[PDB]
Amino acid sequence: ANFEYIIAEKRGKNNTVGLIQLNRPKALNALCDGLIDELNQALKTFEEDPAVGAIVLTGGDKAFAAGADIKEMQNLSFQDCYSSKFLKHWDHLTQVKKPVIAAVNGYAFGGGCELAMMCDIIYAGEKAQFAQPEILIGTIPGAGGTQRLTRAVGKSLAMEMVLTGDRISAQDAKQAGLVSKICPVETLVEEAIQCAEKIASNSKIVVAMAKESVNAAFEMTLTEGSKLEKKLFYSTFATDDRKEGMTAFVEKRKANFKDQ
Template sequence: MSEVLLERPAPGVTLLRLNRPEARNALNLTVRQMLADHFRTLGADVETRCIVLTGNAEVFAAGADIRDMAEATPVDLILRNTHLLWQAIAECPKPIIAAVNGYALGGGCELAMHADMIVAGEGASFGQPEIRVGIMPGAGGTQRLTRAVGKFKAMKMVLTGQPVSARDADAMGLVTEVVPDAEVEDAALKLAGQIARMPPLAVQQIKEVMLAGQDAPLSAALMLERKAFQLLFASRDQREGMQAFLEKRKPAYEGR
Protein backbone atom coordinates (compact mmCIF):
# COMPACT_ATOMS: atom_id res chain seq x y z
CA MET A 1 0.00 0.00 0.00
CA SER A 2 1.20 3.50 -0.80
CA GLU A 3 2.98 5.47 1.93
CA VAL A 4 0.88 8.53 1.02
CA LEU A 5 -2.81 7.96 0.33
CA LEU A 6 -4.96 10.33 -1.72
CA GLU A 7 -8.67 10.63 -1.00
CA ARG A 8 -11.41 12.92 -2.30
CA PRO A 9 -13.88 13.14 0.58
CA ALA A 10 -15.92 16.10 -0.69
CA PRO A 11 -16.33 18.25 -3.81
CA GLY A 12 -13.25 20.43 -4.25
CA VAL A 13 -11.45 18.83 -1.28
CA THR A 14 -8.49 16.47 -1.55
CA LEU A 15 -7.07 14.67 1.47
CA LEU A 16 -3.48 13.40 1.64
CA ARG A 17 -2.85 10.84 4.36
CA LEU A 18 0.63 9.82 5.55
CA ASN A 19 0.61 6.03 5.77
CA ARG A 20 3.67 4.68 7.56
CA PRO A 21 2.11 3.66 10.89
CA GLU A 22 4.91 1.19 11.60
CA ALA A 23 7.38 4.10 11.57
CA ARG A 24 5.09 6.69 13.20
CA ASN A 25 4.80 8.33 9.78
CA ALA A 26 8.49 9.25 9.76
CA LEU A 27 9.38 11.21 6.65
CA ASN A 28 11.77 9.14 4.59
CA LEU A 29 12.90 10.24 1.13
CA THR A 30 10.17 8.24 -0.59
CA VAL A 31 7.42 9.97 1.42
CA ARG A 32 8.91 13.40 0.72
CA GLN A 33 9.07 12.65 -3.00
CA MET A 34 5.49 11.39 -3.03
CA LEU A 35 4.26 14.46 -1.16
CA ALA A 36 6.09 16.75 -3.59
CA ASP A 37 4.57 14.94 -6.58
CA HIS A 38 1.08 15.13 -5.08
CA PHE A 39 1.32 18.83 -4.26
CA ARG A 40 2.64 19.69 -7.72
CA THR A 41 -0.21 17.76 -9.32
CA LEU A 42 -2.92 19.08 -7.01
CA GLY A 43 -1.66 22.63 -7.40
CA ALA A 44 -2.53 22.40 -11.10
CA ASP A 45 -5.74 20.36 -10.63
CA VAL A 46 -8.81 22.52 -11.29
CA GLU A 47 -11.00 20.06 -9.36
CA THR A 48 -8.98 20.58 -6.17
CA ARG A 49 -9.78 23.76 -4.29
CA CYS A 50 -8.40 22.91 -0.85
CA ILE A 51 -6.02 20.22 0.45
CA VAL A 52 -6.10 18.53 3.85
CA LEU A 53 -2.88 16.85 5.00
CA THR A 54 -3.05 14.38 7.87
CA GLY A 55 -1.52 11.31 9.47
CA ASN A 56 -3.51 8.93 11.64
CA ALA A 57 -5.27 9.06 15.01
CA GLU A 58 -2.02 8.43 16.91
CA VAL A 59 0.56 10.51 15.08
CA PHE A 60 0.84 13.16 12.39
CA ALA A 61 4.54 12.65 11.69
CA ALA A 62 7.18 11.90 14.31
CA GLY A 63 9.98 13.50 12.30
CA ALA A 64 12.52 12.62 9.67
CA ASP A 65 13.49 8.98 9.33
CA ILE A 66 16.82 8.85 11.23
CA ARG A 67 17.77 5.66 9.36
CA ASP A 68 17.77 7.71 6.17
CA MET A 69 20.35 10.16 7.45
CA ALA A 70 22.40 8.60 10.24
CA GLU A 71 25.32 7.76 7.93
CA ALA A 72 24.81 10.54 5.38
CA THR A 73 27.63 12.87 4.42
CA PRO A 74 27.19 16.57 3.64
CA VAL A 75 27.57 15.72 -0.06
CA ASP A 76 24.84 13.06 0.24
CA LEU A 77 22.48 15.67 1.69
CA ILE A 78 23.34 18.19 -1.01
CA LEU A 79 22.68 15.67 -3.78
CA ARG A 80 19.30 14.69 -2.34
CA ASN A 81 18.00 18.23 -3.02
CA THR A 82 15.28 17.75 -0.42
CA HIS A 83 14.75 21.51 -0.29
CA LEU A 84 13.16 21.21 -3.73
CA LEU A 85 10.71 18.64 -2.36
CA TRP A 86 9.72 20.96 0.49
CA GLN A 87 9.50 23.82 -2.00
CA ALA A 88 6.83 21.95 -3.96
CA ILE A 89 4.62 22.09 -0.85
CA ALA A 90 5.46 25.69 0.02
CA GLU A 91 4.67 26.84 -3.53
CA CYS A 92 1.36 24.99 -3.90
CA PRO A 93 -1.22 27.66 -4.81
CA LYS A 94 -4.10 25.82 -3.14
CA PRO A 95 -4.85 26.35 0.56
CA ILE A 96 -3.44 23.56 2.73
CA ILE A 97 -4.87 22.51 6.10
CA ALA A 98 -2.82 20.23 8.35
CA ALA A 99 -4.98 18.00 10.55
CA VAL A 100 -2.73 17.00 13.44
CA ASN A 101 -3.26 14.22 15.96
CA GLY A 102 -0.48 13.07 18.24
CA TYR A 103 3.12 13.94 17.52
CA ALA A 104 4.21 16.56 15.00
CA LEU A 105 7.92 16.57 15.74
CA GLY A 106 11.00 17.63 13.79
CA GLY A 107 10.23 17.24 10.12
CA GLY A 108 6.62 16.55 11.12
CA CYS A 109 6.34 19.93 12.79
CA GLU A 110 8.03 21.53 9.77
CA LEU A 111 5.59 19.74 7.48
CA ALA A 112 2.63 21.07 9.48
CA MET A 113 4.10 24.57 9.31
CA HIS A 114 4.13 24.34 5.50
CA ALA A 115 0.33 24.34 5.71
CA ASP A 116 -1.73 27.52 5.72
CA MET A 117 -3.83 26.41 8.69
CA ILE A 118 -3.36 23.78 11.39
CA VAL A 119 -6.26 22.02 13.12
CA ALA A 120 -4.84 20.23 16.16
CA GLY A 121 -6.28 17.65 18.48
CA GLU A 122 -6.17 18.31 22.21
CA GLY A 123 -3.60 15.56 22.59
CA ALA A 124 -1.31 16.80 19.82
CA SER A 125 2.20 18.06 20.51
CA PHE A 126 4.60 20.09 18.41
CA GLY A 127 8.36 20.23 18.68
CA GLN A 128 11.76 20.55 17.03
CA PRO A 129 13.89 17.94 18.87
CA GLU A 130 16.74 17.80 16.33
CA ILE A 131 19.22 19.24 18.81
CA ARG A 132 18.87 16.05 20.86
CA VAL A 133 20.50 14.02 18.08
CA GLY A 134 23.27 16.51 17.40
CA ILE A 135 21.78 18.49 14.54
CA MET A 136 19.31 21.33 13.99
CA PRO A 137 16.09 21.85 12.04
CA GLY A 138 16.74 21.90 8.31
CA ALA A 139 13.36 22.40 6.63
CA GLY A 140 12.14 25.66 8.12
CA GLY A 141 12.10 24.82 11.81
CA THR A 142 14.22 27.82 12.76
CA GLN A 143 12.57 30.21 10.29
CA ARG A 144 8.88 29.35 9.97
CA LEU A 145 8.63 28.69 13.69
CA THR A 146 10.15 32.07 14.55
CA ARG A 147 7.78 33.81 12.16
CA ALA A 148 4.81 31.97 13.67
CA VAL A 149 5.50 32.31 17.42
CA GLY A 150 8.27 34.90 17.78
CA LYS A 151 11.94 34.65 18.72
CA PHE A 152 11.63 33.93 22.43
CA LYS A 153 9.19 31.01 22.23
CA ALA A 154 10.94 29.56 19.17
CA MET A 155 14.38 29.73 20.80
CA LYS A 156 13.20 27.67 23.76
CA MET A 157 11.61 25.02 21.55
CA VAL A 158 14.60 24.69 19.21
CA LEU A 159 17.40 24.92 21.80
CA THR A 160 15.84 22.50 24.31
CA GLY A 161 14.04 20.19 21.93
CA GLN A 162 11.07 20.19 24.28
CA PRO A 163 7.66 19.81 22.61
CA VAL A 164 4.66 21.98 23.41
CA SER A 165 1.08 20.85 23.84
CA ALA A 166 -1.66 21.77 21.42
CA ARG A 167 -3.09 24.27 23.89
CA ASP A 168 0.30 25.95 24.33
CA ALA A 169 0.80 25.92 20.56
CA ASP A 170 -2.58 27.61 20.20
CA ALA A 171 -1.64 30.30 22.73
CA MET A 172 1.63 30.90 20.83
CA GLY A 173 -0.15 31.28 17.50
CA LEU A 174 1.26 28.07 16.03
CA VAL A 175 -2.12 26.46 15.31
CA THR A 176 -5.43 27.69 13.94
CA GLU A 177 -7.72 25.86 16.35
CA VAL A 178 -7.75 23.02 18.86
CA VAL A 179 -10.54 20.44 18.86
CA PRO A 180 -11.15 17.10 20.59
CA ASP A 181 -8.85 14.40 19.21
CA ALA A 182 -11.70 12.42 17.68
CA GLU A 183 -12.92 15.48 15.74
CA VAL A 184 -9.67 16.62 14.12
CA GLU A 185 -10.16 15.20 10.65
CA ASP A 186 -13.85 16.14 10.50
CA ALA A 187 -13.07 19.71 11.64
CA ALA A 188 -10.33 20.05 9.03
CA LEU A 189 -12.59 18.68 6.29
CA LYS A 190 -15.41 21.01 7.32
CA LEU A 191 -13.04 23.98 7.12
CA ALA A 192 -11.72 22.76 3.76
CA GLY A 193 -15.28 22.43 2.47
CA GLN A 194 -16.03 26.03 3.43
CA ILE A 195 -12.96 27.21 1.53
CA ALA A 196 -13.73 24.97 -1.46
CA ARG A 197 -17.07 26.74 -1.86
CA MET A 198 -15.38 30.14 -2.11
CA PRO A 199 -14.31 31.66 -5.46
CA PRO A 200 -11.06 29.83 -6.37
CA LEU A 201 -9.33 32.79 -8.00
CA ALA A 202 -9.92 34.97 -4.94
CA VAL A 203 -8.70 32.17 -2.66
CA GLN A 204 -5.48 31.76 -4.63
CA GLN A 205 -4.85 35.49 -4.82
CA ILE A 206 -5.37 35.85 -1.07
CA LYS A 207 -2.92 33.05 -0.29
CA GLU A 208 -0.32 34.38 -2.72
CA VAL A 209 -0.52 37.96 -1.44
CA MET A 210 -0.47 36.98 2.23
CA LEU A 211 2.60 34.77 1.83
CA ALA A 212 4.47 37.15 -0.45
CA GLY A 213 3.62 40.18 1.64
CA GLN A 214 4.60 38.89 5.06
CA ASP A 215 8.32 39.38 4.41
CA ALA A 216 7.99 42.50 2.25
CA PRO A 217 7.95 46.13 3.40
CA LEU A 218 4.43 47.25 4.25
CA SER A 219 4.27 49.63 1.30
CA ALA A 220 5.20 46.87 -1.15
CA ALA A 221 2.82 44.40 0.49
CA LEU A 222 -0.04 46.87 0.28
CA MET A 223 0.71 47.39 -3.40
CA LEU A 224 0.55 43.60 -3.98
CA GLU A 225 -2.80 43.52 -2.19
CA ARG A 226 -4.17 46.45 -4.18
CA LYS A 227 -3.13 44.99 -7.54
CA ALA A 228 -4.60 41.58 -6.72
CA PHE A 229 -7.83 43.23 -5.55
CA GLN A 230 -8.09 45.13 -8.83
CA LEU A 231 -7.25 42.06 -10.90
CA LEU A 232 -10.14 40.07 -9.44
CA PHE A 233 -12.59 42.52 -11.03
CA ALA A 234 -11.70 40.88 -14.35
CA SER A 235 -13.11 37.54 -13.15
CA ARG A 236 -16.53 36.04 -13.81
CA ASP A 237 -16.57 34.96 -10.17
CA GLN A 238 -16.51 38.61 -9.06
CA ARG A 239 -19.56 39.36 -11.19
CA GLU A 240 -21.29 36.18 -10.05
CA GLY A 241 -20.57 36.84 -6.37
CA MET A 242 -21.82 40.40 -6.39
CA GLN A 243 -24.85 39.60 -8.53
CA ALA A 244 -25.78 36.72 -6.24
CA PHE A 245 -25.48 39.05 -3.26
CA LEU A 246 -27.81 41.57 -4.87
CA GLU A 247 -30.27 38.82 -5.88
CA LYS A 248 -30.11 37.22 -2.41
CA ARG A 249 -29.08 33.78 -3.70
CA LYS A 250 -26.13 31.45 -3.31
CA PRO A 251 -23.32 32.11 -5.80
CA ALA A 252 -22.00 29.41 -8.13
CA TYR A 253 -18.28 29.98 -8.49
CA GLU A 254 -16.39 28.51 -11.45
CA GLY A 255 -12.85 29.73 -10.91
CA ARG A 256 -12.94 31.91 -14.03
Protein backbone atom coordinates in the same frame (compact mmCIF):
# COMPACT_ATOMS: atom_id res chain seq x y z
CA ALA B 1 -1.34 5.51 -8.09
CA ASN B 2 -0.42 2.55 -5.87
CA PHE B 3 1.03 4.61 -3.04
CA GLU B 4 2.47 2.39 -0.31
CA TYR B 5 3.57 5.00 2.26
CA ILE B 6 0.57 7.36 1.95
CA ILE B 7 -3.08 7.15 0.91
CA ALA B 8 -4.46 9.86 -1.38
CA GLU B 9 -8.24 9.95 -1.85
CA LYS B 10 -11.09 12.30 -2.74
CA ARG B 11 -13.20 13.05 0.35
CA GLY B 12 -15.77 15.70 1.17
CA LYS B 13 -19.06 16.78 -0.33
CA ASN B 14 -19.21 16.21 -4.11
CA ASN B 15 -15.56 15.03 -3.99
CA THR B 16 -13.99 18.47 -3.60
CA VAL B 17 -11.40 17.66 -0.89
CA GLY B 18 -8.09 15.90 -1.40
CA LEU B 19 -7.21 13.83 1.67
CA ILE B 20 -3.61 12.61 2.01
CA GLN B 21 -3.32 10.29 5.02
CA LEU B 22 0.15 9.16 6.11
CA ASN B 23 -0.28 5.38 6.37
CA ARG B 24 2.80 4.10 8.21
CA PRO B 25 2.11 2.82 11.77
CA LYS B 26 5.63 1.42 12.20
CA ALA B 27 8.01 4.41 12.34
CA LEU B 28 5.80 7.31 13.55
CA ASN B 29 5.38 8.38 9.90
CA ALA B 30 9.06 8.79 9.09
CA LEU B 31 9.49 11.17 6.14
CA CYS B 32 11.65 8.94 3.96
CA ASP B 33 12.44 9.46 0.27
CA GLY B 34 9.57 7.33 -1.02
CA LEU B 35 7.04 8.94 1.32
CA ILE B 36 8.08 12.45 0.28
CA ASP B 37 8.01 11.42 -3.39
CA GLU B 38 4.49 10.01 -3.06
CA LEU B 39 3.37 13.12 -1.17
CA ASN B 40 4.73 15.39 -3.92
CA GLN B 41 3.05 13.25 -6.59
CA ALA B 42 -0.29 13.41 -4.76
CA LEU B 43 0.05 17.18 -4.32
CA LYS B 44 0.78 17.60 -8.03
CA THR B 45 -2.20 15.40 -8.96
CA PHE B 46 -4.53 17.38 -6.68
CA GLU B 47 -3.16 20.66 -8.07
CA GLU B 48 -3.72 19.56 -11.68
CA ASP B 49 -7.19 18.21 -10.89
CA PRO B 50 -9.91 20.84 -11.49
CA ALA B 51 -12.38 19.30 -9.01
CA VAL B 52 -10.19 19.34 -5.88
CA GLY B 53 -10.33 22.84 -4.42
CA ALA B 54 -8.43 22.26 -1.18
CA ILE B 55 -5.96 19.72 0.20
CA VAL B 56 -6.02 18.27 3.73
CA LEU B 57 -2.84 16.75 5.17
CA THR B 58 -3.47 14.30 8.02
CA GLY B 59 -1.33 11.74 9.81
CA GLY B 60 -1.99 8.94 12.28
CA ASP B 61 -3.87 8.92 15.57
CA LYS B 62 -0.59 8.57 17.51
CA ALA B 63 2.01 10.54 15.52
CA PHE B 64 1.48 12.97 12.65
CA ALA B 65 5.06 12.97 11.33
CA ALA B 66 8.28 12.29 13.25
CA GLY B 67 10.36 14.02 10.56
CA ALA B 68 12.97 12.74 8.16
CA ASP B 69 14.39 9.23 8.47
CA ILE B 70 17.37 9.57 10.81
CA LYS B 71 18.33 5.95 10.02
CA GLU B 72 18.80 6.96 6.36
CA MET B 73 20.70 10.29 6.47
CA GLN B 74 23.20 8.97 9.03
CA ASN B 75 26.08 7.97 6.73
CA LEU B 76 26.00 11.26 4.83
CA SER B 77 28.85 13.75 4.42
CA PHE B 78 28.99 17.46 3.61
CA GLN B 79 29.26 16.83 -0.14
CA ASP B 80 26.35 14.35 -0.22
CA CYS B 81 24.21 16.97 1.56
CA TYR B 82 25.31 20.10 -0.31
CA SER B 83 25.11 18.60 -3.81
CA SER B 84 23.28 15.28 -4.15
CA LYS B 85 19.84 13.67 -4.52
CA PHE B 86 19.28 13.54 -0.73
CA LEU B 87 16.99 16.03 1.03
CA LYS B 88 16.21 18.29 -1.94
CA HIS B 89 12.44 18.00 -2.58
CA TRP B 90 11.13 19.73 0.54
CA ASP B 91 9.73 23.01 -0.86
CA HIS B 92 7.01 21.44 -3.04
CA LEU B 93 4.44 21.98 -0.27
CA THR B 94 4.84 25.77 -0.55
CA GLN B 95 4.77 25.86 -4.37
CA VAL B 96 1.16 24.67 -4.75
CA LYS B 97 -1.48 27.34 -5.37
CA LYS B 98 -4.39 25.53 -3.70
CA PRO B 99 -4.71 25.82 0.09
CA VAL B 100 -3.34 22.98 2.21
CA ILE B 101 -4.68 22.18 5.69
CA ALA B 102 -2.48 20.30 8.18
CA ALA B 103 -4.42 18.06 10.58
CA VAL B 104 -2.05 17.13 13.42
CA ASN B 105 -3.59 14.40 15.59
CA GLY B 106 -0.50 13.25 17.48
CA TYR B 107 3.27 13.71 17.70
CA ALA B 108 4.61 16.33 15.26
CA PHE B 109 8.35 16.61 15.90
CA GLY B 110 11.13 17.71 13.57
CA GLY B 111 9.91 17.61 9.99
CA GLY B 112 6.30 17.22 11.10
CA CYS B 113 6.14 20.69 12.63
CA GLU B 114 7.89 22.08 9.55
CA LEU B 115 5.36 20.52 7.17
CA ALA B 116 2.55 21.76 9.42
CA MET B 117 3.87 25.34 9.42
CA MET B 118 4.41 25.28 5.65
CA CYS B 119 0.64 24.83 5.24
CA ASP B 120 -1.94 27.62 5.39
CA ILE B 121 -4.25 26.37 8.17
CA ILE B 122 -3.02 24.24 11.08
CA TYR B 123 -5.64 22.16 12.90
CA ALA B 124 -4.44 20.26 15.97
CA GLY B 125 -6.10 18.03 18.54
CA GLU B 126 -5.92 17.94 22.32
CA LYS B 127 -3.45 15.03 22.29
CA ALA B 128 -1.01 16.78 19.95
CA GLN B 129 2.47 18.01 20.88
CA PHE B 130 4.99 20.08 18.93
CA ALA B 131 8.74 20.31 19.53
CA GLN B 132 12.11 20.67 17.79
CA PRO B 133 14.21 17.76 19.08
CA GLU B 134 16.94 18.27 16.47
CA ILE B 135 19.21 19.71 19.17
CA LEU B 136 18.94 16.31 20.87
CA ILE B 137 20.82 14.70 17.95
CA GLY B 138 23.31 17.51 17.32
CA THR B 139 21.40 18.95 14.36
CA ILE B 140 19.26 21.97 13.49
CA PRO B 141 16.01 22.26 11.49
CA GLY B 142 16.28 23.02 7.80
CA ALA B 143 12.72 23.43 6.49
CA GLY B 144 11.45 26.48 8.36
CA GLY B 145 11.77 25.17 11.91
CA THR B 146 13.52 28.38 12.98
CA GLN B 147 12.01 30.83 10.45
CA ARG B 148 8.24 30.30 10.43
CA LEU B 149 8.08 29.20 14.08
CA THR B 150 9.79 32.41 15.20
CA ARG B 151 7.60 34.70 13.08
CA ALA B 152 4.35 32.90 14.03
CA VAL B 153 4.90 32.14 17.74
CA GLY B 154 7.65 34.45 18.95
CA LYS B 155 11.35 34.70 19.66
CA SER B 156 11.48 33.45 23.26
CA LEU B 157 9.34 30.33 22.92
CA ALA B 158 10.96 29.39 19.60
CA MET B 159 14.42 29.81 21.14
CA GLU B 160 13.39 27.62 24.08
CA MET B 161 11.90 24.90 21.86
CA VAL B 162 14.95 24.87 19.58
CA LEU B 163 17.63 24.93 22.31
CA THR B 164 15.88 22.52 24.70
CA GLY B 165 13.59 20.39 22.52
CA ASP B 166 10.71 20.81 24.97
CA ARG B 167 7.24 19.66 23.91
CA ILE B 168 4.35 22.12 23.99
CA SER B 169 0.66 21.32 24.29
CA ALA B 170 -2.06 22.31 21.83
CA GLN B 171 -3.38 24.93 24.26
CA ASP B 172 0.01 26.65 24.42
CA ALA B 173 0.30 26.50 20.63
CA LYS B 174 -3.14 28.07 20.22
CA GLN B 175 -2.35 30.76 22.80
CA ALA B 176 0.93 31.54 21.02
CA GLY B 177 -0.44 31.47 17.47
CA LEU B 178 0.87 28.22 16.01
CA VAL B 179 -2.58 26.68 15.43
CA SER B 180 -5.92 28.37 14.79
CA LYS B 181 -8.56 25.96 16.13
CA ILE B 182 -8.50 23.03 18.58
CA CYS B 183 -10.71 20.09 17.62
CA PRO B 184 -11.36 16.70 19.25
CA VAL B 185 -9.11 13.80 18.31
CA GLU B 186 -12.05 11.94 16.74
CA THR B 187 -13.64 14.80 14.76
CA LEU B 188 -10.45 16.60 13.68
CA VAL B 189 -10.58 15.08 10.19
CA GLU B 190 -14.26 16.03 9.95
CA GLU B 191 -13.56 19.66 10.87
CA ALA B 192 -10.66 19.73 8.39
CA ILE B 193 -12.92 18.40 5.63
CA GLN B 194 -15.59 20.97 6.51
CA CYS B 195 -13.02 23.78 6.37
CA ALA B 196 -11.75 22.50 3.02
CA GLU B 197 -15.32 22.45 1.70
CA LYS B 198 -15.89 26.01 2.91
CA ILE B 199 -12.66 27.13 1.23
CA ALA B 200 -13.36 25.31 -2.05
CA SER B 201 -16.90 26.76 -2.21
CA ASN B 202 -15.41 30.05 -3.48
CA SER B 203 -13.65 31.13 -6.67
CA LYS B 204 -10.37 29.27 -7.11
CA ILE B 205 -8.51 32.19 -8.72
CA VAL B 206 -9.61 34.62 -5.99
CA VAL B 207 -8.63 32.09 -3.31
CA ALA B 208 -5.20 31.72 -4.92
CA MET B 209 -4.75 35.50 -5.10
CA ALA B 210 -5.73 35.81 -1.43
CA LYS B 211 -3.26 33.06 -0.51
CA GLU B 212 -0.51 34.88 -2.40
CA SER B 213 -1.43 38.16 -0.69
CA VAL B 214 -1.23 36.51 2.74
CA ASN B 215 2.07 34.78 1.91
CA ALA B 216 3.49 38.13 0.76
CA ALA B 217 3.44 39.26 4.41
CA PHE B 218 6.65 37.30 5.13
CA GLU B 219 8.60 38.28 1.99
CA MET B 220 7.88 42.01 1.51
CA THR B 221 7.54 45.21 3.52
CA LEU B 222 4.32 46.77 4.77
CA THR B 223 4.20 49.57 2.18
CA GLU B 224 5.09 47.34 -0.77
CA GLY B 225 2.81 44.65 0.64
CA SER B 226 -0.11 47.09 0.66
CA LYS B 227 0.83 48.21 -2.86
CA LEU B 228 0.78 44.62 -4.13
CA GLU B 229 -2.51 44.05 -2.29
CA LYS B 230 -4.03 47.08 -4.03
CA LYS B 231 -2.70 45.86 -7.38
CA LEU B 232 -4.24 42.41 -6.88
CA PHE B 233 -7.54 43.92 -5.70
CA TYR B 234 -7.61 46.02 -8.87
CA SER B 235 -6.73 43.01 -11.05
CA THR B 236 -9.58 41.02 -9.48
CA PHE B 237 -11.96 43.27 -11.47
CA ALA B 238 -11.11 41.25 -14.61
CA THR B 239 -13.01 38.07 -13.66
CA ASP B 240 -16.68 37.08 -13.84
CA ASP B 241 -17.17 35.61 -10.35
CA ARG B 242 -16.61 39.06 -8.81
CA LYS B 243 -19.57 40.65 -10.60
CA GLU B 244 -21.64 37.54 -9.87
CA GLY B 245 -20.94 37.88 -6.15
CA MET B 246 -21.67 41.61 -6.27
CA THR B 247 -25.03 40.99 -7.96
CA ALA B 248 -25.82 38.21 -5.47
CA PHE B 249 -25.09 40.53 -2.53
CA VAL B 250 -27.20 43.30 -4.08
CA GLU B 251 -30.12 40.96 -4.82
CA LYS B 252 -29.69 38.98 -1.55
CA ARG B 253 -29.09 35.55 -3.09
CA LYS B 254 -26.35 32.93 -3.35
CA ALA B 255 -23.36 33.64 -5.60
CA ASN B 256 -22.85 30.92 -8.22
CA PHE B 257 -19.10 31.10 -8.81
CA LYS B 258 -17.91 29.53 -12.07
CA ASP B 259 -14.14 29.64 -11.35
CA GLN B 260 -13.61 32.29 -14.03
